[PDB]
PDB file of all heavy atoms in Angstrom:
ATOM      1  N   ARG A   1      -5.369  -6.893   1.647  1.00 34.46           N
ATOM      2  CA  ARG A   1      -6.254  -5.747   1.401  1.00 34.46           C
ATOM      3  C   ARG A   1      -6.475  -4.936   2.654  1.00 34.46           C
ATOM      4  O   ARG A   1      -6.462  -5.523   3.736  1.00 34.46           O
ATOM      5  CB  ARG A   1      -7.697  -6.249   0.937  1.00 34.46           C
ATOM      6  CG  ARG A   1      -7.768  -6.524  -0.534  1.00 34.46           C
ATOM      7  CD  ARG A   1      -8.977  -7.392  -0.893  1.00 34.46           C
ATOM      8  NE  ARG A   1      -9.247  -7.592  -2.276  1.00 34.46           N
ATOM      9  CZ  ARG A   1      -9.597  -6.618  -3.186  1.00 34.46           C
ATOM     10  NH1 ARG A   1      -9.694  -5.358  -2.718  1.00 34.46           N
ATOM     11  NH2 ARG A   1      -9.834  -6.969  -4.438  1.00 34.46           N
ATOM     12  N   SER A   2      -6.628  -3.701   2.513  1.00 34.24           N
ATOM     13  CA  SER A   2      -6.859  -2.801   3.663  1.00 34.24           C
ATOM     14  C   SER A   2      -8.268  -2.817   3.988  1.00 34.24           C
ATOM     15  O   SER A   2      -9.067  -3.593   3.296  1.00 34.24           O
ATOM     16  CB  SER A   2      -6.504  -1.330   3.283  1.00 34.24           C
ATOM     17  OG  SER A   2      -7.462  -0.779   2.433  1.00 34.24           O
ATOM     18  N   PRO A   3      -8.753  -2.206   5.022  1.00 38.53           N
ATOM     19  CA  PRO A   3     -10.181  -2.218   5.384  1.00 38.53           C
ATOM     20  C   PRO A   3     -11.203  -1.653   4.310  1.00 38.53           C
ATOM     21  O   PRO A   3     -12.365  -2.043   4.296  1.00 38.53           O
ATOM     22  CB  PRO A   3     -10.261  -1.455   6.690  1.00 38.53           C
ATOM     23  CG  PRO A   3      -8.904  -1.765   7.305  1.00 38.53           C
ATOM     24  CD  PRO A   3      -8.006  -1.570   6.078  1.00 38.53           C
ATOM     25  N   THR A   4     -10.688  -0.818   3.470  1.00 35.55           N
ATOM     26  CA  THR A   4     -11.571  -0.175   2.417  1.00 35.55           C
ATOM     27  C   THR A   4     -11.304  -0.810   1.063  1.00 35.55           C
ATOM     28  O   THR A   4     -11.717  -0.202   0.017  1.00 35.55           O
ATOM     29  CB  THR A   4     -11.434   1.338   2.376  1.00 35.55           C
ATOM     30  OG1 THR A   4     -10.086   1.743   2.116  1.00 35.55           O
ATOM     31  CG2 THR A   4     -11.923   1.945   3.711  1.00 35.55           C
ATOM     32  N   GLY A   5     -10.666  -1.910   1.012  1.00 34.24           N
ATOM     33  CA  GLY A   5     -10.376  -2.605  -0.324  1.00 34.24           C
ATOM     34  C   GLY A   5      -9.107  -2.515  -1.068  1.00 34.24           C
ATOM     35  O   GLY A   5      -8.851  -3.317  -1.938  1.00 34.24           O
ATOM     36  N   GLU A   6      -8.272  -1.493  -0.719  1.00 34.63           N
ATOM     37  CA  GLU A   6      -7.032  -1.331  -1.519  1.00 34.63           C
ATOM     38  C   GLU A   6      -5.898  -2.383  -1.225  1.00 34.63           C
ATOM     39  O   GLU A   6      -5.845  -2.894  -0.127  1.00 34.63           O
ATOM     40  CB  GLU A   6      -6.460   0.039  -1.240  1.00 34.63           C
ATOM     41  CG  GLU A   6      -7.394   1.174  -1.655  1.00 34.63           C
ATOM     42  CD  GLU A   6      -8.243   1.782  -0.580  1.00 34.63           C
ATOM     43  OE1 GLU A   6      -9.024   1.073   0.090  1.00 34.63           O
ATOM     44  OE2 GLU A   6      -8.090   3.008  -0.370  1.00 34.63           O
ATOM     45  N   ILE A   7      -5.171  -2.699  -2.236  1.00 33.94           N
ATOM     46  CA  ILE A   7      -4.105  -3.683  -2.174  1.00 33.94           C
ATOM     47  C   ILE A   7      -2.847  -3.103  -1.479  1.00 33.94           C
ATOM     48  O   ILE A   7      -2.312  -2.148  -2.011  1.00 33.94           O
ATOM     49  CB  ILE A   7      -3.696  -4.330  -3.495  1.00 33.94           C
ATOM     50  CG1 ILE A   7      -4.975  -4.731  -4.337  1.00 33.94           C
ATOM     51  CG2 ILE A   7      -2.834  -5.572  -3.269  1.00 33.94           C
ATOM     52  CD1 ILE A   7      -5.790  -5.740  -3.663  1.00 33.94           C
ATOM     53  N   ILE A   8      -2.497  -3.698  -0.372  1.00 33.97           N
ATOM     54  CA  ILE A   8      -1.323  -3.252   0.449  1.00 33.97           C
ATOM     55  C   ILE A   8      -0.351  -4.319   0.650  1.00 33.97           C
ATOM     56  O   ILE A   8      -0.583  -5.472   0.429  1.00 33.97           O
ATOM     57  CB  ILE A   8      -1.822  -2.646   1.715  1.00 33.97           C
ATOM     58  CG1 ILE A   8      -2.586  -3.669   2.455  1.00 33.97           C
ATOM     59  CG2 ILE A   8      -2.734  -1.483   1.476  1.00 33.97           C
ATOM     60  CD1 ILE A   8      -3.214  -3.177   3.776  1.00 33.97           C
ATOM     61  N   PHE A   9       0.764  -3.951   1.339  1.00 33.62           N
ATOM     62  CA  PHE A   9       1.754  -4.949   1.671  1.00 33.62           C
ATOM     63  C   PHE A   9       1.241  -5.685   2.878  1.00 33.62           C
ATOM     64  O   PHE A   9       0.540  -5.163   3.718  1.00 33.62           O
ATOM     65  CB  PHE A   9       3.107  -4.400   2.064  1.00 33.62           C
ATOM     66  CG  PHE A   9       3.979  -3.971   0.893  1.00 33.62           C
ATOM     67  CD1 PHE A   9       4.613  -2.745   0.801  1.00 33.62           C
ATOM     68  CD2 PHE A   9       4.145  -4.855  -0.146  1.00 33.62           C
ATOM     69  CE1 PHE A   9       5.395  -2.444  -0.289  1.00 33.62           C
ATOM     70  CE2 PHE A   9       4.956  -4.588  -1.177  1.00 33.62           C
ATOM     71  CZ  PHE A   9       5.615  -3.356  -1.292  1.00 33.62           C
ATOM     72  N   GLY A  10       1.560  -6.957   2.960  1.00 32.26           N
ATOM     73  CA  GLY A  10       1.102  -7.778   4.146  1.00 32.26           C
ATOM     74  C   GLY A  10       2.056  -7.838   5.295  1.00 32.26           C
ATOM     75  O   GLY A  10       3.182  -7.325   5.205  1.00 32.26           O
ATOM     76  N   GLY A  11       1.637  -8.490   6.349  1.00 32.74           N
ATOM     77  CA  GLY A  11       2.451  -8.673   7.524  1.00 32.74           C
ATOM     78  C   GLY A  11       2.033  -7.561   8.574  1.00 32.74           C
ATOM     79  O   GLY A  11       1.116  -6.856   8.337  1.00 32.74           O
ATOM     80  N   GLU A  12       2.809  -7.408   9.638  1.00 33.77           N
ATOM     81  CA  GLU A  12       2.440  -6.317  10.569  1.00 33.77           C
ATOM     82  C   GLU A  12       2.462  -4.998   9.882  1.00 33.77           C
ATOM     83  O   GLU A  12       1.844  -4.119  10.387  1.00 33.77           O
ATOM     84  CB  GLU A  12       3.510  -6.338  11.749  1.00 33.77           C
ATOM     85  CG  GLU A  12       3.285  -7.271  12.906  1.00 33.77           C
ATOM     86  CD  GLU A  12       4.109  -6.907  14.094  1.00 33.77           C
ATOM     87  OE1 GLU A  12       5.329  -6.933  14.048  1.00 33.77           O
ATOM     88  OE2 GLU A  12       3.496  -6.712  15.202  1.00 33.77           O
ATOM     89  N   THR A  13       3.090  -4.945   8.665  1.00 32.33           N
ATOM     90  CA  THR A  13       3.094  -3.716   7.955  1.00 32.33           C
ATOM     91  C   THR A  13       1.777  -3.238   7.403  1.00 32.33           C
ATOM     92  O   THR A  13       1.690  -2.214   6.675  1.00 32.33           O
ATOM     93  CB  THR A  13       4.068  -3.882   6.760  1.00 32.33           C
ATOM     94  OG1 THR A  13       5.045  -4.835   7.049  1.00 32.33           O
ATOM     95  CG2 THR A  13       4.735  -2.508   6.363  1.00 32.33           C
ATOM     96  N   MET A  14       0.766  -3.978   7.772  1.00 30.09           N
ATOM     97  CA  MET A  14      -0.607  -3.628   7.348  1.00 30.09           C
ATOM     98  C   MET A  14      -1.002  -2.336   7.991  1.00 30.09           C
ATOM     99  O   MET A  14      -1.992  -1.681   7.514  1.00 30.09           O
ATOM    100  CB  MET A  14      -1.560  -4.740   7.704  1.00 30.09           C
ATOM    101  CG  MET A  14      -1.656  -4.986   9.209  1.00 30.09           C
ATOM    102  SD  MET A  14      -3.037  -6.034   9.609  1.00 30.09           S
ATOM    103  CE  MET A  14      -2.350  -7.602   9.056  1.00 30.09           C
ATOM    104  N   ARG A  15      -0.368  -1.948   9.076  1.00 30.42           N
ATOM    105  CA  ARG A  15      -0.658  -0.724   9.776  1.00 30.42           C
ATOM    106  C   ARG A  15      -0.101   0.513   9.151  1.00 30.42           C
ATOM    107  O   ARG A  15      -0.513   1.615   9.459  1.00 30.42           O
ATOM    108  CB  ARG A  15      -0.082  -0.823  11.195  1.00 30.42           C
ATOM    109  CG  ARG A  15       1.452  -0.926  11.297  1.00 30.42           C
ATOM    110  CD  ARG A  15       1.981  -0.794  12.622  1.00 30.42           C
ATOM    111  NE  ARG A  15       1.304  -1.679  13.573  1.00 30.42           N
ATOM    112  CZ  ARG A  15       1.738  -1.912  14.851  1.00 30.42           C
ATOM    113  NH1 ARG A  15       2.840  -1.397  15.239  1.00 30.42           N
ATOM    114  NH2 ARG A  15       1.087  -2.738  15.690  1.00 30.42           N
ATOM    115  N   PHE A  16       0.745   0.324   8.245  1.00 30.53           N
ATOM    116  CA  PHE A  16       1.453   1.465   7.601  1.00 30.53           C
ATOM    117  C   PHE A  16       1.019   1.676   6.103  1.00 30.53           C
ATOM    118  O   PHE A  16       1.696   2.248   5.257  1.00 30.53           O
ATOM    119  CB  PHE A  16       2.949   1.278   7.581  1.00 30.53           C
ATOM    120  CG  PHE A  16       3.529   1.196   9.029  1.00 30.53           C
ATOM    121  CD1 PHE A  16       4.344   0.174   9.374  1.00 30.53           C
ATOM    122  CD2 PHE A  16       3.357   2.231   9.932  1.00 30.53           C
ATOM    123  CE1 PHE A  16       4.987   0.076  10.639  1.00 30.53           C
ATOM    124  CE2 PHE A  16       3.947   2.168  11.223  1.00 30.53           C
ATOM    125  CZ  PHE A  16       4.742   1.061  11.573  1.00 30.53           C
ATOM    126  N   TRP A  17      -0.154   1.104   5.798  1.00 32.76           N
ATOM    127  CA  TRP A  17      -0.619   1.201   4.443  1.00 32.76           C
ATOM    128  C   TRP A  17      -0.944   2.644   3.983  1.00 32.76           C
ATOM    129  O   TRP A  17      -1.387   2.758   2.820  1.00 32.76           O
ATOM    130  CB  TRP A  17      -1.868   0.263   4.228  1.00 32.76           C
ATOM    131  CG  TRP A  17      -3.119   0.880   4.627  1.00 32.76           C
ATOM    132  CD1 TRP A  17      -3.678   0.846   5.836  1.00 32.76           C
ATOM    133  CD2 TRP A  17      -4.123   1.503   3.795  1.00 32.76           C
ATOM    134  NE1 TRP A  17      -4.964   1.399   5.903  1.00 32.76           N
ATOM    135  CE2 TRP A  17      -5.210   1.831   4.613  1.00 32.76           C
ATOM    136  CE3 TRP A  17      -4.167   1.756   2.467  1.00 32.76           C
ATOM    137  CZ2 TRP A  17      -6.355   2.465   4.088  1.00 32.76           C
ATOM    138  CZ3 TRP A  17      -5.283   2.451   1.967  1.00 32.76           C
ATOM    139  CH2 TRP A  17      -6.429   2.784   2.729  1.00 32.76           C
ATOM    140  N   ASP A  18      -0.720   3.545   4.786  1.00 34.41           N
ATOM    141  CA  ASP A  18      -0.879   4.948   4.486  1.00 34.41           C
ATOM    142  C   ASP A  18       0.442   5.599   4.088  1.00 34.41           C
ATOM    143  O   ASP A  18       0.518   6.824   3.827  1.00 34.41           O
ATOM    144  CB  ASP A  18      -1.449   5.705   5.695  1.00 34.41           C
ATOM    145  CG  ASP A  18      -2.840   5.332   6.056  1.00 34.41           C
ATOM    146  OD1 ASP A  18      -3.742   5.358   5.137  1.00 34.41           O
ATOM    147  OD2 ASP A  18      -3.075   5.035   7.234  1.00 34.41           O
ATOM    148  N   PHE A  19       1.436   4.796   3.950  1.00 31.99           N
ATOM    149  CA  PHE A  19       2.744   5.338   3.559  1.00 31.99           C
ATOM    150  C   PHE A  19       2.897   5.582   2.013  1.00 31.99           C
ATOM    151  O   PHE A  19       2.541   4.700   1.301  1.00 31.99           O
ATOM    152  CB  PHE A  19       3.896   4.473   3.919  1.00 31.99           C
ATOM    153  CG  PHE A  19       5.245   4.829   3.324  1.00 31.99           C
ATOM    154  CD1 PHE A  19       5.913   5.923   3.794  1.00 31.99           C
ATOM    155  CD2 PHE A  19       5.706   4.243   2.146  1.00 31.99           C
ATOM    156  CE1 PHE A  19       6.992   6.414   3.159  1.00 31.99           C
ATOM    157  CE2 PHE A  19       6.832   4.727   1.502  1.00 31.99           C
ATOM    158  CZ  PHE A  19       7.410   5.810   1.981  1.00 31.99           C
ATOM    159  N   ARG A  20       3.283   6.792   1.667  1.00 32.25           N
ATOM    160  CA  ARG A  20       3.464   7.189   0.319  1.00 32.25           C
ATOM    161  C   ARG A  20       4.916   7.612   0.226  1.00 32.25           C
ATOM    162  O   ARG A  20       5.474   8.178   1.114  1.00 32.25           O
ATOM    163  CB  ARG A  20       2.511   8.223  -0.095  1.00 32.25           C
ATOM    164  CG  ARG A  20       1.044   7.960   0.270  1.00 32.25           C
ATOM    165  CD  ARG A  20       0.393   6.888  -0.469  1.00 32.25           C
ATOM    166  NE  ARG A  20       0.243   7.122  -1.910  1.00 32.25           N
ATOM    167  CZ  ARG A  20      -0.639   8.005  -2.391  1.00 32.25           C
ATOM    168  NH1 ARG A  20      -1.456   8.650  -1.524  1.00 32.25           N
ATOM    169  NH2 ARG A  20      -0.747   8.215  -3.686  1.00 32.25           N
ATOM    170  N   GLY A  21       5.554   7.242  -0.910  1.00 29.96           N
ATOM    171  CA  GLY A  21       6.974   7.645  -1.046  1.00 29.96           C
ATOM    172  C   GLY A  21       7.488   7.612  -2.462  1.00 29.96           C
ATOM    173  O   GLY A  21       7.161   6.599  -3.182  1.00 29.96           O
ATOM    174  N   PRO A  22       8.373   8.466  -2.913  1.00 28.23           N
ATOM    175  CA  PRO A  22       8.857   8.453  -4.232  1.00 28.23           C
ATOM    176  C   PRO A  22       9.180   6.982  -4.696  1.00 28.23           C
ATOM    177  O   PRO A  22       8.669   6.493  -5.703  1.00 28.23           O
ATOM    178  CB  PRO A  22      10.100   9.382  -4.179  1.00 28.23           C
ATOM    179  CG  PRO A  22      10.509   9.326  -2.792  1.00 28.23           C
ATOM    180  CD  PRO A  22       9.198   9.363  -2.099  1.00 28.23           C
ATOM    181  N   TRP A  23      10.098   6.329  -4.007  1.00 26.63           N
ATOM    182  CA  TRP A  23      10.520   5.002  -4.388  1.00 26.63           C
ATOM    183  C   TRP A  23       9.404   3.966  -4.499  1.00 26.63           C
ATOM    184  O   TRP A  23       9.501   3.110  -5.377  1.00 26.63           O
ATOM    185  CB  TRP A  23      11.520   4.521  -3.386  1.00 26.63           C
ATOM    186  CG  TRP A  23      11.022   4.359  -1.999  1.00 26.63           C
ATOM    187  CD1 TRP A  23      10.938   5.332  -1.006  1.00 26.63           C
ATOM    188  CD2 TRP A  23      10.420   3.167  -1.341  1.00 26.63           C
ATOM    189  NE1 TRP A  23      10.399   4.812   0.151  1.00 26.63           N
ATOM    190  CE2 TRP A  23      10.068   3.484  -0.060  1.00 26.63           C
ATOM    191  CE3 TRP A  23      10.175   1.842  -1.896  1.00 26.63           C
ATOM    192  CZ2 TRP A  23       9.447   2.604   0.735  1.00 26.63           C
ATOM    193  CZ3 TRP A  23       9.532   0.968  -1.116  1.00 26.63           C
ATOM    194  CH2 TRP A  23       9.192   1.394   0.241  1.00 26.63           C
ATOM    195  N   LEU A  24       8.328   4.098  -3.770  1.00 27.81           N
ATOM    196  CA  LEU A  24       7.277   3.156  -3.844  1.00 27.81           C
ATOM    197  C   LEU A  24       6.070   3.377  -4.739  1.00 27.81           C
ATOM    198  O   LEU A  24       5.332   2.502  -5.221  1.00 27.81           O
ATOM    199  CB  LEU A  24       6.750   2.793  -2.395  1.00 27.81           C
ATOM    200  CG  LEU A  24       5.491   1.927  -2.225  1.00 27.81           C
ATOM    201  CD1 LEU A  24       5.703   0.566  -2.897  1.00 27.81           C
ATOM    202  CD2 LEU A  24       5.169   1.838  -0.752  1.00 27.81           C
ATOM    203  N   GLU A  25       5.779   4.699  -4.963  1.00 24.64           N
ATOM    204  CA  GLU A  25       4.679   5.153  -5.727  1.00 24.64           C
ATOM    205  C   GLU A  25       4.445   4.461  -7.131  1.00 24.64           C
ATOM    206  O   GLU A  25       3.375   4.028  -7.505  1.00 24.64           O
ATOM    207  CB  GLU A  25       4.622   6.640  -5.894  1.00 24.64           C
ATOM    208  CG  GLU A  25       4.377   7.253  -4.528  1.00 24.64           C
ATOM    209  CD  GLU A  25       3.241   6.566  -3.771  1.00 24.64           C
ATOM    210  OE1 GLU A  25       2.155   6.254  -4.370  1.00 24.64           O
ATOM    211  OE2 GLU A  25       3.381   6.300  -2.531  1.00 24.64           O
ATOM    212  N   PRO A  26       5.563   4.487  -7.948  1.00 23.95           N
ATOM    213  CA  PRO A  26       5.503   3.902  -9.342  1.00 23.95           C
ATOM    214  C   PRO A  26       4.954   2.436  -9.342  1.00 23.95           C
ATOM    215  O   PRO A  26       4.657   1.875 -10.472  1.00 23.95           O
ATOM    216  CB  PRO A  26       6.948   3.943  -9.798  1.00 23.95           C
ATOM    217  CG  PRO A  26       7.303   5.270  -9.140  1.00 23.95           C
ATOM    218  CD  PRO A  26       6.848   5.124  -7.750  1.00 23.95           C
ATOM    219  N   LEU A  27       4.785   1.844  -8.198  1.00 21.84           N
ATOM    220  CA  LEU A  27       4.240   0.535  -8.147  1.00 21.84           C
ATOM    221  C   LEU A  27       2.737   0.518  -7.804  1.00 21.84           C
ATOM    222  O   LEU A  27       2.022  -0.450  -7.942  1.00 21.84           O
ATOM    223  CB  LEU A  27       4.947  -0.364  -7.029  1.00 21.84           C
ATOM    224  CG  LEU A  27       6.359  -0.721  -7.409  1.00 21.84           C
ATOM    225  CD1 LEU A  27       6.987  -1.592  -6.242  1.00 21.84           C
ATOM    226  CD2 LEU A  27       6.388  -1.512  -8.694  1.00 21.84           C
ATOM    227  N   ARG A  28       2.310   1.667  -7.357  1.00 19.20           N
ATOM    228  CA  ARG A  28       0.907   1.823  -6.957  1.00 19.20           C
ATOM    229  C   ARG A  28       0.010   2.074  -8.237  1.00 19.20           C
ATOM    230  O   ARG A  28       0.426   2.700  -9.148  1.00 19.20           O
ATOM    231  CB  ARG A  28       0.706   3.045  -6.062  1.00 19.20           C
ATOM    232  CG  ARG A  28      -0.446   2.884  -5.064  1.00 19.20           C
ATOM    233  CD  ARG A  28      -0.605   4.116  -4.208  1.00 19.20           C
ATOM    234  NE  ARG A  28       0.562   4.304  -3.319  1.00 19.20           N
ATOM    235  CZ  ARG A  28       0.841   3.509  -2.327  1.00 19.20           C
ATOM    236  NH1 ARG A  28       0.099   2.565  -1.963  1.00 19.20           N
ATOM    237  NH2 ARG A  28       1.949   3.756  -1.617  1.00 19.20           N
ATOM    238  N   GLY A  29      -1.177   1.392  -8.193  1.00 16.77           N
ATOM    239  CA  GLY A  29      -2.147   1.543  -9.267  1.00 16.77           C
ATOM    240  C   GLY A  29      -3.335   2.377  -8.798  1.00 16.77           C
ATOM    241  O   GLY A  29      -3.160   3.069  -7.783  1.00 16.77           O
ATOM    242  N   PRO A  30      -4.453   2.391  -9.522  1.00 16.31           N
ATOM    243  CA  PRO A  30      -5.546   3.122  -9.068  1.00 16.31           C
ATOM    244  C   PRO A  30      -6.238   2.415  -7.892  1.00 16.31           C
ATOM    245  O   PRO A  30      -7.060   3.028  -7.192  1.00 16.31           O
ATOM    246  CB  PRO A  30      -6.440   3.168 -10.364  1.00 16.31           C
ATOM    247  CG  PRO A  30      -6.219   1.797 -10.856  1.00 16.31           C
ATOM    248  CD  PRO A  30      -4.724   1.604 -10.748  1.00 16.31           C
ATOM    249  N   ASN A  31      -5.872   1.200  -7.631  1.00 19.57           N
ATOM    250  CA  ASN A  31      -6.470   0.375  -6.557  1.00 19.57           C
ATOM    251  C   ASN A  31      -5.422  -0.023  -5.506  1.00 19.57           C
ATOM    252  O   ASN A  31      -5.655  -0.874  -4.695  1.00 19.57           O
ATOM    253  CB  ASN A  31      -7.102  -0.941  -7.104  1.00 19.57           C
ATOM    254  CG  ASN A  31      -8.523  -0.647  -7.484  1.00 19.57           C
ATOM    255  OD1 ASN A  31      -8.886   0.476  -7.920  1.00 19.57           O
ATOM    256  ND2 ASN A  31      -9.323  -1.709  -7.504  1.00 19.57           N
ATOM    257  N   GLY A  32      -4.217   0.599  -5.545  1.00 21.15           N
ATOM    258  CA  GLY A  32      -3.148   0.299  -4.690  1.00 21.15           C
ATOM    259  C   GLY A  32      -2.258  -0.648  -5.398  1.00 21.15           C
ATOM    260  O   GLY A  32      -2.581  -1.190  -6.513  1.00 21.15           O
ATOM    261  N   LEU A  33      -1.044  -0.938  -4.789  1.00 19.54           N
ATOM    262  CA  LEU A  33      -0.089  -1.849  -5.385  1.00 19.54           C
ATOM    263  C   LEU A  33      -0.626  -2.743  -6.546  1.00 19.54           C
ATOM    264  O   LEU A  33      -1.641  -3.446  -6.382  1.00 19.54           O
ATOM    265  CB  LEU A  33       0.477  -2.752  -4.334  1.00 19.54           C
ATOM    266  CG  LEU A  33       1.127  -2.069  -3.095  1.00 19.54           C
ATOM    267  CD1 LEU A  33       1.701  -3.147  -2.217  1.00 19.54           C
ATOM    268  CD2 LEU A  33       2.162  -1.148  -3.554  1.00 19.54           C
ATOM    269  N   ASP A  34      -0.074  -2.543  -7.737  1.00 18.21           N
ATOM    270  CA  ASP A  34      -0.582  -3.235  -8.891  1.00 18.21           C
ATOM    271  C   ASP A  34       0.230  -4.476  -9.159  1.00 18.21           C
ATOM    272  O   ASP A  34       1.401  -4.462  -9.296  1.00 18.21           O
ATOM    273  CB  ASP A  34      -0.432  -2.345 -10.130  1.00 18.21           C
ATOM    274  CG  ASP A  34      -0.918  -3.021 -11.465  1.00 18.21           C
ATOM    275  OD1 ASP A  34      -2.049  -3.504 -11.514  1.00 18.21           O
ATOM    276  OD2 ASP A  34      -0.094  -3.123 -12.352  1.00 18.21           O
ATOM    277  N   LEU A  35      -0.459  -5.698  -9.199  1.00 20.74           N
ATOM    278  CA  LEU A  35       0.220  -6.924  -9.265  1.00 20.74           C
ATOM    279  C   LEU A  35       1.066  -7.077 -10.563  1.00 20.74           C
ATOM    280  O   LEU A  35       1.911  -7.985 -10.587  1.00 20.74           O
ATOM    281  CB  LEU A  35      -0.800  -8.124  -9.161  1.00 20.74           C
ATOM    282  CG  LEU A  35      -0.167  -9.467  -8.963  1.00 20.74           C
ATOM    283  CD1 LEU A  35       0.714  -9.547  -7.832  1.00 20.74           C
ATOM    284  CD2 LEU A  35      -1.295 -10.545  -8.956  1.00 20.74           C
TER     285      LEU A  35
END
């Protein structure tokens, strides 16, 4: 989870949770990455 509650990718990649992109968006939900 990010500092404000949204579900993001883990690992050092936690710093890039602001990345948005065609290929990745369809996986995002209203709360971030949908399981």
Side-chain angles (χ1 to χ4, degrees):
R1 276 163 175 293
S2 75
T4 59
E6 298 100 302
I7 312 298
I8 58 185
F9 277 132
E12 276 196 300
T13 330
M14 59 171 76
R15 62 169 50 166
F16 301 126
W17 82 275
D18 291 308
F19 168 75
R20 309 294 290 290
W23 63 272
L24 170 61
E25 294 315 316
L27 287 182
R28 207 181 299 288
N31 273 26
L33 304 186
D34 180 57
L35 192 59

